[PDB]
Amino acid sequence: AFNDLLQQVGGVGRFQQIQVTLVVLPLLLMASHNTLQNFTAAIPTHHCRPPADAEVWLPRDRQGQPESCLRFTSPTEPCTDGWIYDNSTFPSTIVTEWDLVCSHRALRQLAQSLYMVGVLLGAMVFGYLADRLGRRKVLILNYLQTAVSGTCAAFAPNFPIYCAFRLLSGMALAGISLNCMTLNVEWMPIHTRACVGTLIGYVYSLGQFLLAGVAYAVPHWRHLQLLVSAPFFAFFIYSWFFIESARWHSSSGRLDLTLRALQRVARINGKREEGAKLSMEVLRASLQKEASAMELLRCPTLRHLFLCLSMLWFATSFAYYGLVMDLQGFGVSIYLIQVIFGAVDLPAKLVGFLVINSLGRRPAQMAALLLAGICILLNGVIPQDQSIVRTSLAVLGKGCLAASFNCIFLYTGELYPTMIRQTGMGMGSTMARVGSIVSPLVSMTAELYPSMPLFIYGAVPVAASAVTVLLPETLGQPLPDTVQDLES
Numbered sequence: 001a002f003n004d005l006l007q008q009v010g011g012v013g014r015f016q017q018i019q020v021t022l023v024v025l026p027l028l029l030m031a032s033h034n035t036l037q038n039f040t041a042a043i044p045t046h047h048c049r050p051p052a053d054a055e056v057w058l059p060r061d062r063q064g065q066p067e068s069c070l071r072f073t074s075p076t077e078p079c080t081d082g083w084i085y086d087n088s089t090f091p092s093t094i095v096t097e098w099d100l101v102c103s104h105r106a107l108r109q110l111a112q113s114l115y116m117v118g119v120l121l122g123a124m125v126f127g128y129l130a131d132r133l134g135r136r137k138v139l140i141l142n143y144l145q146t147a148v149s150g151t152c153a154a155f156a157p158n159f160p161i162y163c164a165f166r167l168l169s170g171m172a173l174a175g176i177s178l179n180c181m182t183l184n185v186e187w188m189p190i191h192t193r194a195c196v197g198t199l200i201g202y203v204y205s206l207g208q209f210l211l212a213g214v215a216y217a218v219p220h221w222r223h224l225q226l227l228v229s230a231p232f233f234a235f236f237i238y239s240w241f242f243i244e245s246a247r248w249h250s251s252s253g254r255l256d257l258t259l260r261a262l263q264r265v266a267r268i269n270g271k272r273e274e275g276a277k278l279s280m281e282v283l284r285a286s287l288q289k290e291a292s293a294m295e296l297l298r299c300p301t302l303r304h305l306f307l308c309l310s311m312l313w314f315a316t317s318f319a320y321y322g323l324v325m326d327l328q329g330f331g332v333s334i335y336l337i338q339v340i341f342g343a344v345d346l347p348a349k350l351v352g353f354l355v356i357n358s359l360g361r362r363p364a365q366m367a368a369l370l371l372a373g374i375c376i377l378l379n380g381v382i383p384q385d386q387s388i389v390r391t392s393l394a395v396l397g398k399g400c401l402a403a404s405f406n407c408i409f410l411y412t413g414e415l416y417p418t419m420i421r422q423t424g425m426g427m428g429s430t431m432a433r434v435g436s437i438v439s440p441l442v443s444m445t446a447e448l449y450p451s452m453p454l455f456i457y458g459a460v461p462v463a464a465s466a467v468t469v470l471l472p473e474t475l476g477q478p479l480p481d482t483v484q485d486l487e488s
Contacts, residue, residue, distance in 0.1 A: 015265055020196060023242075040094065092222075111163050117437055131248070139239060209342055293427075308470060312408060314434055317434075377459070413425065414479065
């Protein structure tokens, strides 16, 4: 009877209206910390540096641009000296610092892959530790670790040091991304739980505008990293004023902490008269009524559904985190491309929400996945000469993939049974990062063909679109109470 206690205290009060906002506010930096390898590691035009022995020194070809590989040893040798980088729009990037051009092109993808690997470990470890040490302590440690491991990456003189710092930053960001939702969902009542779930996605979607504005404000990559990682100290400094969740305290076994927290919340809300009436015996009278991960195995009913949902999550995450990167080559400047990409998610979600409830869950998911797959696959045949339909197809695919996540989140949440739902959500979110890790590894194959990664990015959603026809439709149907009554 925790719900009746929340309604007795006041439910949605001033304390919630302060705490949920002060917790969701730092999430605006998700886009800045995630999709940074478009601005901080841009590749400008470059050519070989001639030796200091002196225009006609380079083997220019393909309509006369200088060749960055050969150098005309006689007035056919590798460079091994250095390069001259343009400084008209990119004064300093990663490839400018350590000369990561023409011989070490894959190390950018390697650093991105390491940052993506550093997400699963952080999510697993800190999600395991949060249910043992408490949400507020883990949030405090995350706030500290993010700033400490982010502000030192701008002064890294070597590449592996920067990679390790970015991996630890990805650890901290994965931890905070899980723990913000975990702490925010608990305090809200049963009838307003779904309202705050969509609100956090709105905050995540708004980060691209801030990222574009900050990137336009400072071109220099060290100052960019410092300015992005700076506000985490100011976020950490007031983090000691949060109140621990009463549900975790009650499930732990200590009820005096729940009584003290409820009384304190009554003082903040101004309803201390109900808090005085609230005592120990009513918690022992109303909360008297207050599943392994391997149960998916050796049970075909759960395993058959789990395999398909994991495949869908993997395919959607792979397509999204492959499309969002490599913004260069579109002709339009990346600053405009960022805001145009950020301005497409809202109408796509608006269309998708009505499409789900007007047609069906599975038909909407199939339509979104098939449309995204064919739209990405169409991009691989039209040449470089055009400059409008490429951007149109890219933004349509990005918005449609965002709608695909918006559909599959509610589909996965509603489809699973009640008891196994939490670990199903956790395993689905875990599987939704393997594709993100793999996407730089398959993007590394751009050397062989200039459109093979683009062909790969379109084939997986197309293949997974026809996979969805193997699931029952659960629109306007009761949720499965257990496995015994799960037949349709």
